[PDB]
Structure formats: structure tokens, C-alpha cells
mmCIF file of C-alpha atoms in Angstrom:
data_model
loop_
_atom_site.group_PDB
_atom_site.id
_atom_site.type_symbol
_atom_site.label_atom_id
_atom_site.label_comp_id
_atom_site.label_asym_id
_atom_site.label_seq_id
_atom_site.Cartn_x
_atom_site.Cartn_y
_atom_site.Cartn_z
ATOM 1 C CA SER A 26 -0.107 0.007 0.057
ATOM 2 C CA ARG A 27 0.933 3.759 -0.077
ATOM 3 C CA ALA A 28 3.118 5.355 2.675
ATOM 4 C CA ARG A 29 0.907 8.156 4.068
ATOM 5 C CA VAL A 30 3.178 10.873 5.787
ATOM 6 C CA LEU A 31 2.896 14.501 6.417
ATOM 7 C CA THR A 32 4.645 17.087 4.286
ATOM 8 C CA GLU A 33 5.055 20.724 5.402
ATOM 9 C CA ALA A 34 7.396 23.626 5.275
ATOM 10 C CA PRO A 35 8.194 24.537 9.023
ATOM 11 C CA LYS A 36 8.607 28.415 9.732
ATOM 12 C CA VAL A 37 10.009 27.337 13.078
ATOM 13 C CA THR A 38 13.592 28.460 13.804
ATOM 14 C CA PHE A 39 16.255 27.781 16.501
ATOM 15 C CA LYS A 40 15.395 30.968 18.195
ATOM 16 C CA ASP A 41 12.078 29.154 18.789
ATOM 17 C CA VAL A 42 13.660 26.648 20.969
ATOM 18 C CA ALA A 43 14.739 26.966 24.727
ATOM 19 C CA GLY A 44 18.261 25.810 25.319
ATOM 20 C CA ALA A 45 19.637 22.936 23.362
ATOM 21 C CA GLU A 46 22.348 25.506 22.015
ATOM 22 C CA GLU A 47 24.959 22.684 22.057
ATOM 23 C CA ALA A 48 22.897 20.386 19.783
ATOM 24 C CA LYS A 49 21.917 23.395 17.617
ATOM 25 C CA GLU A 50 25.448 24.192 16.804
ATOM 26 C CA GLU A 51 26.125 20.589 15.544
ATOM 27 C CA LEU A 52 22.844 20.827 13.504
ATOM 28 C CA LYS A 53 24.274 24.134 11.918
ATOM 29 C CA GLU A 54 26.079 21.867 9.700
ATOM 30 C CA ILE A 55 22.956 19.840 8.827
ATOM 31 C CA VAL A 56 21.171 23.268 8.053
ATOM 32 C CA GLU A 57 24.035 24.424 5.638
ATOM 33 C CA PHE A 58 24.078 21.007 3.998
ATOM 34 C CA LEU A 59 20.438 21.377 3.260
ATOM 35 C CA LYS A 60 20.934 24.997 2.143
ATOM 36 C CA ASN A 61 23.788 24.214 -0.353
ATOM 37 C CA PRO A 62 24.140 20.457 -0.603
ATOM 38 C CA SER A 63 26.001 21.182 -3.923
ATOM 39 C CA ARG A 64 28.898 23.124 -2.086
ATOM 40 C CA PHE A 65 29.389 20.052 0.299
ATOM 41 C CA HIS A 66 29.668 17.272 -2.302
ATOM 42 C CA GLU A 67 32.004 19.574 -4.251
ATOM 43 C CA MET A 68 34.283 19.741 -1.223
ATOM 44 C CA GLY A 69 35.262 16.892 0.717
ATOM 45 C CA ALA A 70 32.366 17.762 3.043
ATOM 46 C CA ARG A 71 30.886 15.182 5.519
ATOM 47 C CA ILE A 72 27.554 14.911 3.743
ATOM 48 C CA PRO A 73 25.005 13.769 6.525
ATOM 49 C CA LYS A 74 22.387 11.120 5.955
ATOM 50 C CA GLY A 75 21.010 10.123 9.256
ATOM 51 C CA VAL A 76 20.866 12.308 12.393
ATOM 52 C CA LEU A 77 19.614 10.321 15.404
ATOM 53 C CA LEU A 78 18.615 12.559 18.376
ATOM 54 C CA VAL A 79 19.094 10.926 21.742
ATOM 55 C CA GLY A 80 17.463 12.115 24.856
ATOM 56 C CA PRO A 81 14.577 11.568 27.462
ATOM 57 C CA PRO A 82 10.911 11.988 26.327
ATOM 58 C CA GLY A 83 9.301 15.348 26.058
ATOM 59 C CA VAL A 84 12.903 17.021 25.909
ATOM 60 C CA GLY A 85 11.815 18.432 22.462
ATOM 61 C CA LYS A 86 13.651 16.211 20.032
ATOM 62 C CA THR A 87 10.857 16.091 17.324
ATOM 63 C CA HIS A 88 10.484 19.969 18.006
ATOM 64 C CA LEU A 89 14.037 20.470 17.309
ATOM 65 C CA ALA A 90 14.289 18.401 14.096
ATOM 66 C CA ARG A 91 11.434 20.593 12.918
ATOM 67 C CA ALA A 92 13.421 23.878 13.799
ATOM 68 C CA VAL A 93 16.056 22.323 11.592
ATOM 69 C CA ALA A 94 13.935 22.041 8.463
ATOM 70 C CA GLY A 95 12.739 25.540 9.084
ATOM 71 C CA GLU A 96 16.217 26.839 9.753
ATOM 72 C CA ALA A 97 17.141 25.759 6.325
ATOM 73 C CA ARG A 98 13.791 26.821 4.757
ATOM 74 C CA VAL A 99 13.495 23.233 3.521
ATOM 75 C CA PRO A 100 10.480 20.747 3.622
ATOM 76 C CA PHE A 101 9.880 18.550 6.571
ATOM 77 C CA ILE A 102 8.290 15.114 5.715
ATOM 78 C CA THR A 103 7.336 13.128 8.730
ATOM 79 C CA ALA A 104 6.369 9.425 9.072
ATOM 80 C CA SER A 105 5.714 6.965 11.887
ATOM 81 C CA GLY A 106 7.854 3.950 11.917
ATOM 82 C CA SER A 107 4.791 2.543 13.940
ATOM 83 C CA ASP A 108 2.718 3.015 10.904
ATOM 84 C CA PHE A 109 5.202 0.766 8.871
ATOM 85 C CA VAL A 110 5.092 -2.210 11.129
ATOM 86 C CA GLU A 111 1.616 -1.681 12.310
ATOM 87 C CA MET A 112 0.121 -2.893 8.900
ATOM 88 C CA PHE A 113 1.246 -6.501 8.153
ATOM 89 C CA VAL A 114 1.713 -7.891 4.756
ATOM 90 C CA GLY A 115 4.625 -6.888 2.409
ATOM 91 C CA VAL A 116 3.385 -3.223 3.141
ATOM 92 C CA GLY A 117 5.951 -2.450 5.680
ATOM 93 C CA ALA A 118 8.572 -2.090 3.154
ATOM 94 C CA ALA A 119 6.384 -0.892 0.261
ATOM 95 C CA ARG A 120 5.567 2.083 2.366
ATOM 96 C CA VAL A 121 9.117 2.920 3.417
ATOM 97 C CA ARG A 122 9.870 2.707 -0.133
ATOM 98 C CA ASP A 123 7.147 5.291 -0.811
ATOM 99 C CA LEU A 124 8.262 7.663 1.996
ATOM 100 C CA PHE A 125 11.524 8.182 0.068
ATOM 101 C CA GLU A 126 9.951 8.312 -3.308
ATOM 102 C CA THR A 127 7.871 11.299 -2.012
ATOM 103 C CA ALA A 128 11.072 12.575 -0.375
ATOM 104 C CA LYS A 129 13.248 12.426 -3.525
ATOM 105 C CA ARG A 130 10.632 14.701 -5.119
ATOM 106 C CA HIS A 131 11.132 17.282 -2.338
ATOM 107 C CA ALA A 132 14.871 17.082 -1.835
ATOM 108 C CA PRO A 133 16.567 18.634 -0.209
ATOM 109 C CA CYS A 134 14.248 17.828 2.697
ATOM 110 C CA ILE A 135 14.281 16.490 6.292
ATOM 111 C CA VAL A 136 12.611 12.950 6.532
ATOM 112 C CA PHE A 137 11.573 12.461 10.180
ATOM 113 C CA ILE A 138 10.891 8.797 11.133
ATOM 114 C CA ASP A 139 8.857 8.964 14.388
ATOM 115 C CA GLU A 140 9.192 6.101 16.875
ATOM 116 C CA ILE A 141 11.857 4.558 14.840
ATOM 117 C CA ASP A 142 12.230 2.247 17.863
ATOM 118 C CA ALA A 143 9.358 0.281 16.373
ATOM 119 C CA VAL A 144 11.555 -0.070 13.273
ATOM 120 C CA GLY A 145 15.003 -0.729 14.506
ATOM 121 C CA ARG A 146 14.389 -2.338 17.987
ATOM 122 C CA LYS A 147 17.039 -5.006 17.510
ATOM 123 C CA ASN A 156 9.040 -10.372 14.400
ATOM 124 C CA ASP A 157 10.172 -10.585 10.713
ATOM 125 C CA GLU A 158 7.684 -7.719 9.951
ATOM 126 C CA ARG A 159 10.182 -5.275 11.202
ATOM 127 C CA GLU A 160 13.426 -6.783 9.569
ATOM 128 C CA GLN A 161 11.663 -6.191 6.246
ATOM 129 C CA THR A 162 10.857 -2.538 7.041
ATOM 130 C CA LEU A 163 14.366 -2.083 8.545
ATOM 131 C CA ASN A 164 16.242 -3.579 5.663
ATOM 132 C CA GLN A 165 14.528 -1.287 3.133
ATOM 133 C CA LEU A 166 15.432 1.802 5.356
ATOM 134 C CA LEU A 167 19.159 0.829 4.740
ATOM 135 C CA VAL A 168 18.616 0.322 1.056
ATOM 136 C CA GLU A 169 17.022 3.751 0.675
ATOM 137 C CA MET A 170 19.654 5.539 2.665
ATOM 138 C CA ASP A 171 22.583 3.684 1.306
ATOM 139 C CA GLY A 172 21.075 4.620 -2.231
ATOM 140 C CA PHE A 173 20.961 8.290 -1.678
ATOM 141 C CA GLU A 174 22.197 10.338 -4.812
ATOM 142 C CA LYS A 175 24.040 13.574 -4.857
ATOM 143 C CA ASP A 176 21.119 15.334 -6.230
ATOM 144 C CA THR A 177 18.910 13.642 -3.472
ATOM 145 C CA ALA A 178 19.762 15.828 -0.616
ATOM 146 C CA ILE A 179 17.695 14.002 1.987
ATOM 147 C CA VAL A 180 18.629 14.132 5.799
ATOM 148 C CA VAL A 181 16.586 11.449 7.591
ATOM 149 C CA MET A 182 16.161 12.378 11.184
ATOM 150 C CA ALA A 183 15.009 10.262 13.957
ATOM 151 C CA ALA A 184 14.766 10.443 17.881
ATOM 152 C CA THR A 185 15.053 7.840 20.639
ATOM 153 C CA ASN A 186 16.274 7.288 24.186
ATOM 154 C CA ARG A 187 17.889 3.698 23.858
ATOM 155 C CA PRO A 188 20.543 3.777 20.989
ATOM 156 C CA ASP A 189 22.055 0.793 22.633
ATOM 157 C CA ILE A 190 18.837 -1.530 22.021
ATOM 158 C CA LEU A 191 18.903 -0.174 18.471
ATOM 159 C CA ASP A 192 19.980 -2.458 15.546
ATOM 160 C CA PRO A 193 23.698 -1.615 14.895
ATOM 161 C CA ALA A 194 22.889 -1.502 11.150
ATOM 162 C CA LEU A 195 21.005 1.824 11.289
ATOM 163 C CA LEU A 196 23.886 3.149 13.276
ATOM 164 C CA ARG A 197 26.671 1.960 10.756
ATOM 165 C CA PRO A 198 28.267 4.632 8.537
ATOM 166 C CA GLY A 199 26.053 5.692 5.764
ATOM 167 C CA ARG A 200 22.836 5.595 7.744
ATOM 168 C CA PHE A 201 22.323 7.160 11.074
ATOM 169 C CA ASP A 202 26.163 7.831 11.796
ATOM 170 C CA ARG A 203 25.432 11.051 13.638
ATOM 171 C CA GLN A 204 23.936 11.047 17.187
ATOM 172 C CA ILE A 205 23.076 14.350 18.969
ATOM 173 C CA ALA A 206 22.186 14.546 22.670
ATOM 174 C CA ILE A 207 19.071 16.343 23.695
ATOM 175 C CA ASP A 208 19.088 16.373 27.460
ATOM 176 C CA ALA A 209 16.732 17.794 29.996
ATOM 177 C CA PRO A 210 17.152 21.636 30.132
ATOM 178 C CA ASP A 211 19.572 23.065 32.601
ATOM 179 C CA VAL A 212 18.815 25.568 35.364
ATOM 180 C CA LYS A 213 18.665 28.375 32.977
ATOM 181 C CA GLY A 214 16.889 26.290 30.365
ATOM 182 C CA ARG A 215 14.175 25.465 32.607
ATOM 183 C CA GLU A 216 14.114 29.038 33.612
ATOM 184 C CA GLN A 217 13.453 30.205 30.025
ATOM 185 C CA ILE A 218 10.693 27.396 29.558
ATOM 186 C CA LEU A 219 8.941 28.565 32.809
ATOM 187 C CA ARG A 220 8.973 32.208 31.722
ATOM 188 C CA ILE A 221 7.600 31.477 28.241
ATOM 189 C CA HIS A 222 4.628 29.483 29.547
ATOM 190 C CA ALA A 223 4.223 31.885 32.581
ATOM 191 C CA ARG A 224 3.377 34.800 30.341
ATOM 192 C CA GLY A 225 0.013 33.592 29.229
ATOM 193 C CA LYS A 226 -0.707 32.599 32.730
ATOM 194 C CA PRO A 227 -1.442 34.882 35.850
ATOM 195 C CA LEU A 228 1.170 34.811 38.705
ATOM 196 C CA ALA A 229 1.417 36.551 42.070
ATOM 197 C CA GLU A 230 4.589 38.648 42.841
ATOM 198 C CA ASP A 231 5.556 35.898 45.416
ATOM 199 C CA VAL A 232 6.143 33.474 42.693
ATOM 200 C CA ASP A 233 9.806 33.363 41.977
ATOM 201 C CA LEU A 234 10.488 31.688 38.611
ATOM 202 C CA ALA A 235 14.350 31.612 38.870
ATOM 203 C CA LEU A 236 13.822 29.597 42.123
ATOM 204 C CA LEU A 237 11.142 27.357 40.623
ATOM 205 C CA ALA A 238 13.723 26.713 37.723
ATOM 206 C CA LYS A 239 16.382 25.803 40.127
ATOM 207 C CA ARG A 240 14.093 23.730 42.267
ATOM 208 C CA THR A 241 12.901 21.634 39.214
ATOM 209 C CA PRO A 242 15.996 19.488 38.276
ATOM 210 C CA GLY A 243 14.902 16.799 35.935
ATOM 211 C CA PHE A 244 11.739 18.346 34.673
ATOM 212 C CA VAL A 245 11.227 18.350 30.878
ATOM 213 C CA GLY A 246 9.635 21.110 28.836
ATOM 214 C CA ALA A 247 6.161 19.411 29.069
ATOM 215 C CA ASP A 248 6.713 19.037 32.847
ATOM 216 C CA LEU A 249 7.327 22.706 33.606
ATOM 217 C CA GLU A 250 4.058 23.277 31.673
ATOM 218 C CA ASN A 251 1.961 20.964 33.920
ATOM 219 C CA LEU A 252 3.399 22.583 37.062
ATOM 220 C CA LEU A 253 2.070 25.878 35.739
ATOM 221 C CA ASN A 254 -1.156 24.829 34.032
ATOM 222 C CA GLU A 255 -1.878 22.654 37.173
ATOM 223 C CA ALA A 256 -1.082 25.296 39.725
ATOM 224 C CA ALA A 257 -3.567 27.574 37.766
ATOM 225 C CA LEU A 258 -6.335 24.979 38.243
ATOM 226 C CA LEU A 259 -5.384 24.477 41.920
ATOM 227 C CA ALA A 260 -5.906 28.150 42.361
ATOM 228 C CA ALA A 261 -8.843 28.737 40.157
ATOM 229 C CA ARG A 262 -10.363 26.056 42.350
ATOM 230 C CA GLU A 263 -10.047 28.245 45.395
ATOM 231 C CA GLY A 264 -11.830 31.059 43.813
ATOM 232 C CA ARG A 265 -8.361 32.567 43.563
ATOM 233 C CA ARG A 266 -7.142 34.264 40.410
ATOM 234 C CA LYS A 267 -3.245 34.225 40.212
ATOM 235 C CA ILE A 268 -0.696 31.410 40.655
ATOM 236 C CA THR A 269 1.113 31.577 43.996
ATOM 237 C CA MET A 270 4.272 29.986 45.099
ATOM 238 C CA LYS A 271 2.194 27.974 47.335
ATOM 239 C CA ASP A 272 -0.067 26.485 44.538
ATOM 240 C CA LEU A 273 3.171 25.612 42.620
ATOM 241 C CA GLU A 274 4.265 23.684 45.767
ATOM 242 C CA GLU A 275 1.105 21.728 45.971
ATOM 243 C CA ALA A 276 1.119 20.854 42.153
ATOM 244 C CA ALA A 277 4.637 19.348 42.491
ATOM 245 C CA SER A 278 2.972 16.879 44.885
#
């Protein structure tokens, strides 16, 4: 059967992501290869092919691979490795085959395989899907500037094939935001939400080690309800304390 993906030109930029500046830099190469693939091949350039983002969930990996496509003003085709193995029959591959057929038509372009763990989680239905992914990537022509991006949190349980040179031979770490990072996140979400002067974001940021982007959201969104519940209007450092419980 057909592949069925989601093509779209992202307007998102790096300036639209809190932290991950370390990872952003590495990606700066991916962005310029997409902008001028010609130049790269001309020179002895690295020429990326598979960028595997590694980090905890809700850390904003998918959100970053999107800022990459936008940063280069290039298309961002998405797909779900889950959809590939989900449907049985010789479909699994036939779809992966399509995904890059639609990709070659929009190259340069970032192809994002979501839940690649479903595809390369080191039971024959997968193997067939995985194998095709290596043939497509190992079969990328110079005029085909497709940079396949995927995310995960277990590059160790991932079939060594996908990681071998020529495929996803480039891992970037997207860790939980640092004190400052969390601070930025909390401020961004706090603006559309009321707060009492007693609420100290800086403190909240330093007091939330381990919280992911989507975690600092709850804390705020949740504290809002906890206060709105007591006929209160603003979020007090007190409600934020009760939410973390």
C-alpha cells in the first residue's frame, strides 16, 4: 500500500527553542548542507544522511528536528515507523519505499521517522521494514539531498545496522534543560498565565531539576487550576508547591 506521511514547510527556527544550544550548533552543519548540498559534495564535506537525536521523552527532540527544516527553509516530511510495522503484509517495506519516493521529489528535505524504535528495535515484519530503510539511505544520490532524522532514548537496543556509517552515523544529545533552560521555559509559559509577585521563577527553575519542557508546563497549568479552584485568580508559590505533589 501507499506510505501516507505529513509534508510541510516549517517556519520554526532555532530562536524558537529553549536551550539545546549545544545540539543546535552541531545541527548548524545539517542546516547548511540542506541549504547548499552542492557545495558540500564539491568539497570533501561530511555529507550527512542520518541524524539520530538521543534524549529523554518530552525533551523536544521532534520539535528540534522541525526547527532544523525551518532553519534551512526546507521541507519537513514526517512518518511513523509505527505505521510501517503496524500494518502487516509486504506493506511495511512498500511504504518505506514510498516515503523516500515522496522524499526524492522534495529533496533537499528532512525526513523524520517517528518512533524509529518500532522499526529498529534490534518479528520478521520489522526486519523487512528495517532492511528497506538501509537500502534507501545507502542509495541516496548527490542530487537527492535527504537528511533522515529520528529520535530515541535507547541507541543501545537499536540495531547496529542503522547506526553503521552511511545511515544514522550521527547522534546528537538532547538532554533535560539545565537550570537556565528550565528558567526560560517557565517564563515562556508563565506569560499567558497569571502569577503572584511571590512567585519566583528563577527559584522554581532551580528547584525543578529533571523536569522536561512538558513537565514545567503542567506545574504551571496545574497550579492555575489548583488556584482557580479556590476562587483564586493568580498562581502563588504555594499552589506551585502543591502541584509538585
